[PDB]
């Protein structure tokens, strides 16, 4: 009854939280759903000596996830369920994201960059590699005369990336920092409910029972204002962080569109050196 | 609101035995310390207590009329039955069933029933008979104890407007039940062995008979002679 | 937690024979070495005289006697037995409730006494350790066993030593409020703790 | 009503929230033991004299006063310092019981402010007394056919006796100026006399056993409290609880955690209680709030049809009191599950979307798209032979409306005092 | 005053998104219209002509 006379602050807070929560699905869709069809890799693995079994999905595992993706998911570790708030599940599950990534990988290793502009056109992997070498300014004869060495170097590099990722390096700190800061902000918001804010006690029942009802409002109102201010601060912090998350999602979507679906010419956008694929 | 219904035969003969039943609503006899009693009131002579039943299986009876009184309880449909034998024409009076909730030394009969009239066919308490007082100025009514000390047990006061059941005005010798006017008060004179009810200012209407009671294990509930108060 | 804790790496007086009176200082950590059956109990009070009541705790062969009765103790109280050479008179006794005794490379006994909000709280545990003449290593948490609602003032205490016709070593330390960080395992048992003011590294922790 | 429009578009909208209310509000408390020794005070076969009244201290026990209330033998029952109706729940530090045998007419003066032989010479009661006085007739026990002559009381005494004082010395009284020095001469009398108790005596002369109870409050913590009641347990329902003064509201269920013997409740995360030991059965019960969540309505637009579906987020769907389908984001009613998969029309959550059959609302798992396998070989290529040109539209905002707000005209409104 | 401050903070937050959208639109106008872009999907699906 005392809160309903303060206006419609809580309607604005709920609208802000809904707007923050609804854009995560949009970010995921605009990053991962750039493909229109689910391409499947052929059962044969004659890719000119290149070994892609380390990144292709593994049917032996129930959710068909890749080995490197399994390592990444196992490396990253941790909200709770309690009174006051709730958490919503994402629209897209992990299996759908894995399927999208598998389709993108199959399309980019079985058809080159042709599938990024229209219908997928099949082409042997060696000729696609020759296309990319001609793109970076080197003639294709050096590829056709050094195919085995390049394949061996690629396999060794993939193994080295696997070893480095399994070396417990601090490379996954970007996601862990976001998870930790969200968790600590939520924990601070929860713990702010035990403050006194100048009242006789933090417990609402004690205030409403010990004191006489027509004079307890001067104690209720300050606690209400303090809790409202804490909630507003939390909402403002979440709104500020959502912009950074959206900017990172936009950058990731642009990098996926340019580096994966084509051959980028701008330097250092898709790694140090002359980008191939 | 808790109310009590009592009904029974009206005509009775010296060779016949009657029965009374008081049905109560709004409360249950299974509650702790709850009890139902029977109090008769003669038309022109002072009322007296007859029998009582508690929440557990124990019965109280008037010592002078213990043989002729028997009370039975029935919690199945919330009623109590009182039976009396040996009809004698002086028995004609108005019968009440009242509720008491507690040990007995302390709690008065807070809720009373409705008047039921039965007519035939074919340790004392002393109280002044009547007092007359002009309006405005205060007045007091005494209630003395013949044997023992009035300070040995609590004294409760009642008022009974005509055509209505008595209502408590003073309990535990100092307390005031909710709803009564503030002008009512009580005190005890330990030296003279008497208790007095004081009305501080006759600024309202009070046409009722005032009674006093007390409780003792040997004598049980006993009522005074009553005082008739009128406004000059 | 912010409570009265014994500081880490703090000096504790070591005695041997003797039983001097010591100030309470709102908390006492008492420890008794192993192979020692001499210590029987403690005497708590303000002046240990007939002016004010005093708390008496004595552990005999089968039980413990708890009295906050009025006492007038002797100069050197002490206990085929020669016993009860501790007081000369005792009247107007209020709390007289007898309880189950706490005790029946021997054990190391540790005790913590504190008087807050009119209640007397005892924490104790027993563990068998070697190294008679020095305080051992390791970690140990004391569990409460009894809470006495006495309400009296405590400012001094004295230990009671059994004498038969005999030196036993015990440690005394004083508590003071400072902040500790406690660690709980998968069970409810405290495994380790640190002091938030001992070192800058502890402050970072 | 929430959208402030008579027509709605296809989608899902959050309307309101729902809760589950408690129904029982049970209370638990430990067993009632160690009753105070009232029996050995009232039912004792031995009673002291008037001048040598006994004194007993009773502490640290629950005092059940119902036995005194329901007793049908007491003659007088008066409390002079406290409301006697509240003796069953009030708590005190220590109580005392004084027992003696006096003449029946002498029971009147066992009260504050009253003067008499016993009041001034034997037993004086202070004016600030806080306790109850109990007495009853005991003629059949303290009187014999030959006459009892054992009880004594003091009738000669130089000075008045202060409250709660006892005088056991029986030296002769110095009524005369000369010192008697123990001789039984004139003006030198025995300061005690005996009662002539006989069974044929009057009511005012029969012996009466008197028990006096006194209540005191000090700065020490209270020990003698009154008995407290308790109710039964209810589980797997939203219910209020009170465990040894710990109040709350939640669902009580069984638990697997093992508390330490001295521990009572748990505060593992955010200092919130979630497990409480039962004081009676010594069992650990988990605590969880029953239910809370929002309500969403799924509609295909009022232009198409008026049929709607209701979704409750994060609900086990067994407390909602048509087709009922359990979804990982809470169940929804009014929607028919199907084996088929299509593109997402109205998102629901966890890979579930809803659409209109075009004449009922159905729910299905999302389909990412058509699945095809490209014919890959090490000597095959695909080359287009035609081309098509296409035009696409892209829209980006660049600016918004420029607004300015003044404080004094908004916060105050041309008010001088407000400014 | 608190309501006014909340409104001002919301407007300040939205201004950043508006400015970012304006910057993206300016970049797209500079690159897609005044020239022929080579980066894929920046100026529409397929091989951008004009
Ligand atoms: C390539 O596609 C164009 C359309 O983009 C074809 O041109 C059409 O061909 C049909 C064949 O009967 C005619 O009816 C239409 O009038 C043509 N023009 C249009 C605008 O549709 C063309 O035939 C295709 N093939 C080649 C080799 O150019
Ligand atoms: C590809 O690598 C995996 C693991 O490194 C290996 O088991 C497999 O035999 C390799 N494939 C070829 C064709 O060498
Ligand atoms: C030891 O104390 C208990 C009570 O504390 C007592 O019952 C017992 O008799 C005592 N034993 C000796 C030997 O004094
Ligand atoms: C209690 O007893 C002691 C016995 O030493 C006595 O000195 C003291 O005065 C007594 N106090 C009271 C209040 O009776
Ligand atoms: C204890 O000390 C307080 C002052 O802090 C004093 O008032 C009190 O009388 C003392 N004694 C007791 C038994 O509390
Ligand atoms: C608790 O202690 C017991 C030993 O009594 C041990 O077996 C158990 O693993 C510990 N942890 C848990 C969670 O029970
Ligand atoms: C005394 O004896 C009577 C009769 O056996 C019993 O009802 C009562 O509980 C006993 N105790 C007291 C305090 O009256
Ligand atoms: C409490 O009393 C009940 C009934 O007598 C008994 O079953 C239960 O074990 C008791 N609990 C304790 C802790 O004594
Ligand atoms: C309703 O839907 C139909 C088809 O979906 C459409 O043609 C029509 O414009 C819509 N609006 C109205 C007002 O009928
Ligand atoms: C809902 O609760 C029931 C009963 O506990 C349980 O069997 C069921 O699995 C729950 N639903 C879900 C989705 O977990
Ligand atoms: C979907 O198919 C499963 C068989 O795996 C069947 O059990 C289920 O009933 C089907 N769904 C519906 C809505 O009939
Ligand atoms: C791959 O090349 C070999 C010859 O090196 C040929 O025999 C085989 O058929 C080719 N694979 C496919 C799928 O055509």
Author numbering:
A (entry chain G): 751 to 828, 852 to 1050
B (entry chain D): 1 to 35, 35A, 35B, 36 to 82, 82A, 82B, 82C, 83 to 100, ...
C (entry chain G): 51 to 66, 79 to 141, 153 to 177, 186 to 246, 261 to 300
D (entry chain A): 301 to 621, 640 to 676, 690 to 750
E (entry chain A): 1001 to 1050
Source paper text:
The spike proteins of SARS-CoV-2 are considered to be prime antibody targets as they are readily accessible on the viral surface and have an essential role in viral attachment and infection of host cells. Using this library, a phage panning campaign was completed using SARS-CoV-2 S1 and the receptor binding domain (RBD), leading to the discovery of anti-SARS-CoV-2 RBD antibodies Ab 12 and Ab 2-7. To examine the mode of binding of Ab 2-7 to SARS-CoV-2 spike, we initiated structural studies by electron microscopy (EM). We obtained two high-resolution 3D cryo-EM reconstructions of Ab 2-7 scFv complexed with SARS-CoV-2 S D614G: one with two scFvs bound to a spike trimer, and the other with three scFvs bound (3.4 Å and 3.0 Å respectively).
A Side and (B) top views of a composite 3D cryo-EM reconstruction of Ab 2-7 scFvs bound to the receptor binding domains of SARS-CoV-2 spike ectodomains at 3.0 Å resolution. Local refinement of a masked region comprising the spike RBD, NTD, and Ab 2-7 scFv improved the quality of the 3D reconstruction for the 3-scFv-bound structure, allowing us to conclude that Ab 2-7 binds to the non-receptor binding motif (RBM) core of the RBD using a mix of heavy and light chain interactions from CDR H3 and L1-L3 as well as two residues from the framework region of the light chain. The interface features a dozen hydrogen bonds, five π-π stacking interactions, and 829 Å of buried surface area with the π-π interactions clustered around three residues in the non-RBM core of the spike RBD: Y369, F377, and P384. Comparison of the three structures (zero, two and three Ab 2-7 scFvs bound) sheds light on the mechanism of Ab 2-7 scFv binding to the spike trimer. Superposition with the apo-spike structure reveals that Ab 2-7 scFv would clash with the RBD of the neighboring spike protomer if it were in the down-conformation and therefore cannot fully engage its binding epitope until at least two RBDs are in the up conformation. Once bound, Ab 2-7 scFv prevents the RBD from accessing the down conformation. Furthermore, superposition of Fab constant regions (CH1/CL) onto the Ab 2-7 scFv structure indicates that the CH1/CL domains would clash with the NTD of the neighboring protomer. Ab 2-7 scFv thus binds to the spike in a manner that would be inaccessible to its Fab form. Ab 2-7 binds the conserved RBD core and does not directly compete with ACE2. Conversely, Ab 2-7 targets an epitope on the conserved RBD core, partially overlapping with the broadly-neutralizing Ab S2X25928.
